């Protein structure tokens, strides 16, 4: 099943765990045959985490990101483990914001304080 | 030529203005031709500027990797054919801890389409 993404390539090979309106965990095996291909740029990590967050929430648009630290370089051979948490949602100012964290071998390679998304 | 960027593409067609230790303006004419996508992914706009900023750090002096980014806001959508006008500003140079901080803005037809408060670079 596939849904939004302005970015052409979905960066979530698998949603291994999801809890409606609360949290979601997924992962990505970085192959040597990735469309954006050697290291996965942290900018595409934001993306992956953005998509996951979007999976959870499910129109939506990526309105902004805050607090991003790329502590480590993702390499082909690395499996990006990701978890995003819904911080707030507003059937008002139609805005939703979640936080995301990505790991490699149980170690944090990326941190995102808050990703903001807007309706339609 | 020159530049480290872990994104295969150089999202900056050309630097139309440079003031070392201070600022830099560049253009990116979004084309239907490219890889990312049809609308331009916000994250690549972070990328497009991040590279523009990097180009400036390189002019200041030394490898600089992208370590953090804050206060990013995507106001308007960038469509193909749009001419991205970006400008990064050198915030600091606390390269005690080997770290640089630039801010950045991108405009399309004189209107702000993206804002990045702080982009952090560092070590090697």
Q: How far is A8 from chain B (nearest CA, A)?
A: 5
Angle formed at CA A70 by CA A24 and CA A59, multiple of 5 degrees: 40
How far is the CA of A90 from the CAs of A52, B8, B27, in angstroms?
A: 19, 38, 37
Alpha carbons A25 and B16: distance in angstroms, whole number: 43
User: Can you read off the two tokens belonging to residue A107?
Assistant: 């170690």
> Is A120 in CB contact (< 8 Å) with chain B?
no
DSSP B77: P
Q: Mark yes or no for CB contact A6/B72 under 8 Å.
A: no
Give the 3-state secondary structure of residue A43.
helix
Contact A41 B71 (CB under 8 A): no
Do the beta carbons of residue B15 and residue A44 sit within 8 Å?
A: no
Concatenated DSSP letters of B41-65: -HHHHHHHHHHHHHHHHHHH----E
Distance between alpha carbon A89 and the CA centroid of its chain, in Å? 17
Q: Is B45 exposed, middle or buried (0-12, 13-18, 19+ CB in 10 A)?
A: buried
Find, in chain A, the residue whose alpha carbon is nearest to that of B4.
A41
Q: Distance between alpha carbon A33 and the CA centroid of its chain, in Å?
A: 20
**Gap between the Cα atoms of B87 and B53, Å rounded:** 8
Q: What resolution, expressed in A, was reported for this entry?
A: 3.0
H or E segment at A48?
Answer: helix A42-57
What's A14's domain CATH number?
A: 3.10.129.10
Query: Residues 6 or more apart from A17 whose CB is under 8 A from it?
Result: A23, A24, A25
Give the position of tokens 């990526």.
A62
- Cβ contact B46–A44 (<8 Å): no
Sheet holding B83-90: strands in order across?
A: A14-19, A23-29, A79-89, A95-104, A107-119, A60-70, B65-74, B111-122, B99-108, B83-90, B23-29, B14-19
| Torsion sign (Cα): A88, A94, A99, A104 | positive
- B102 to chain A, minimum CA–CA distance in Å? 14
d(CA A115, CA A104): 21
Give the one of A47, A63, A65 whose C-beta lies nearest to B41's C-beta: A47
**By the 8 A CB rule, do A100 and A90 touch?**
no
3-state secondary structure (DSSP) of residue A76: strand
Find out whether A30 and A74 touch, Cβ atoms under 8 Å. Answer: yes
For an interface test with B, give the residue of A34, A40, A41 to mutate (most B CBs within 10 A).
Answer: A41
Q: Determination method here? A: X-ray
Residue located via tokens 């129109």: A59
Total number of domains in chain A: 1
Q: Which helix (H) or strand (E) holds A53?
A: helix A42-57
Distance from CA of B103 to the nearest CA of A (A): 13
Interface test with A, best of B5, B11, B39, B69 (most A CBs within 10 A): B69
Domain span including residue A83: 1-120
């Amino acid at each position: 099943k596939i849904l939004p993404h302005r970015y052409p390539f979905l960066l979530v090979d698998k949603v291994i765990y999801m809890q409606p309106n609360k949290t979601i965990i997924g992962l990505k095996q970085v192959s040597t045959n990735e469309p954006f291909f050697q290291i996965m740029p942290g900018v595409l990590q934001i993306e992956a985490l953005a998509q996951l967050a979007g999976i959870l929430c499910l129109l939506f648009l990526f309105a902004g990101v805050d607090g991003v630290r790329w502590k480590k370089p993702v390499l082909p051979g690395d499996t990006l483990t990701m978890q995003a948490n819904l911080i707030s949602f507003k059937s008002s100012l139609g805005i939703a914001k979640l936080s995301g964290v990505g790991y490699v071998n149980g170690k944090v390679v990326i941190n995102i304080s808050e990703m903001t998304f807007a309706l339609s």
